[PDB]
Amino acid sequence: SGFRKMAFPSGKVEGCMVQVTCGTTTLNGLWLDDVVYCPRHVICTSEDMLNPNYEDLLIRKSNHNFLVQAGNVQLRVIGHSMQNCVLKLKVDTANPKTPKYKFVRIQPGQTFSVLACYNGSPSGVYQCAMRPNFTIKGSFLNGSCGSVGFNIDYDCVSFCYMHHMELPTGVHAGTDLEGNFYGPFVDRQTAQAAGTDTTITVNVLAWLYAAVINGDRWFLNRFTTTLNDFNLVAMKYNYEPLTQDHVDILGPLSAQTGIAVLDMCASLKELLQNGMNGRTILGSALLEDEFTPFDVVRQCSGVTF
């Protein structure tokens, strides 16, 4: 019993974190095999902020301008290259702690664990969702650049996020591990802002299923709805459209609880229209949308790695 915001165990990622310094800028990097991945922002100075030409900044650098520290050990940089908004520093030492890994670009609505780091040292671990607006609601201070987000599947770390920047509303923007931003963001100083966000409807339904599995039914009702009629209410409350693919993905939770997806949609419609009348669901007075259907199955079935 119980239902928590549960991160993956972080040990496989902790062993990959390093500190990268160029000039007076220090941030985190990810050491896999003999490569260190980090935000290309590390080559900027406090002037190369408004319109940096990174190709021009990087051609002016030598391997020796990059200091990489793993614990209290200095790794010698023997090659450097830029891929989109990441820098790849080839080092003279393969990481003996390199886990089985992949790089994956996730869809909005997917969740991942963040290992927040400072100066190449892990600080803490928490669960995030990629928002529909391609931001994350993280927790990052100055120095957290190059902190990574990941999922674990049996033996294999899927890296999906590298942190770059904080936007004016205090939400966060970053890249895949090939250096492509999520969303329209750029690594320069502009008036860029988070777009309007929406609630992840399939995740809210997953979490209502979690609540039933965990022995709570107060919010259920005897009604059903059509997908089309549900989506007309979704739109009114700034919820993502529910697709047939989302209905299919909820099939396993539907089967385990004996509650049809469109019946759970009718519960959600009543919750949006009426609110909770001072009641809670899994300890929350709001409708939670940062658990995927896979996250619910994992935490109700006890899969390990």
Place this chain on the structure above:
Amino acid sequence: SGFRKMAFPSGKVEGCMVQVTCGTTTLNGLWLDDVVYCPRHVICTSEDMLNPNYEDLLIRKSNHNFLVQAGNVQLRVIGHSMQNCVLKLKVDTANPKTPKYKFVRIQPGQTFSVLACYNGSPSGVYQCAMRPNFTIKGSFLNGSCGSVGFNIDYDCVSFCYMHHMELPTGVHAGTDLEGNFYGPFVDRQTAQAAGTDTTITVNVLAWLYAAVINGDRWFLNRFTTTLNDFNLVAMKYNYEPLTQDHVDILGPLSAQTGIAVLDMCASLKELLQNGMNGRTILGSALLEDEFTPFDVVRQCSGVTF
């Protein structure tokens, strides 16, 4: 910016988890140096549930009745002893991954990270508080017995909780790592239930300070209160009494925000009396009490390990 339920990085603990089997019972153990710690329940059969005499059950065991597996490696048990409600199995191999560590018995209101495990394999990591009633609101399935709770301080893992059992309301009970239960619970089948719980008042004030640090002031007011008058309202809403020690512990957050502790108490009193009028604080529509003052400072100052 941002504020998350943040766990400690789990790698130092992952390297200590093992599987222990006695008869048909399998659960998790903690391998530190050449000792494996696990719940003494592992020696019970489905009959030794109502009134087990553990001393009598254990004298009937041989070292060879205990199977300890670290990854796919079997550790030979060379000695066994019982300390309160834990079993200590001496093994022929020291854990080469043993971190710097301590065993600590925490106070109610303190928080810790749980590494939920099954079959000696870590599943996930989340933050918990020890409730005033000496339960935790965890997330544990069958097989999670012997999962541990911990805090990390620089280089040093402080183990504070070993999981034993689920109580009828779906909350959890366990021991310190010397095998003493938190609360009045026993490792036998009885009508034991969680006592009435209360809200951790000092933690709610810490989290209101977090909300100010993170740029939110809507709930503040121009009033102050006396400690005595605040506690008369605390009592009405089933909040823990606020002590002068709690006031002293909030001093650093008070100093950083320029909001006197008793002024923040006046904000909390108004929130209890009026509710939030459909507003949120740090993404929550309820008053959060599972962040200590130390947890707020850590996540607003960026301490690492």
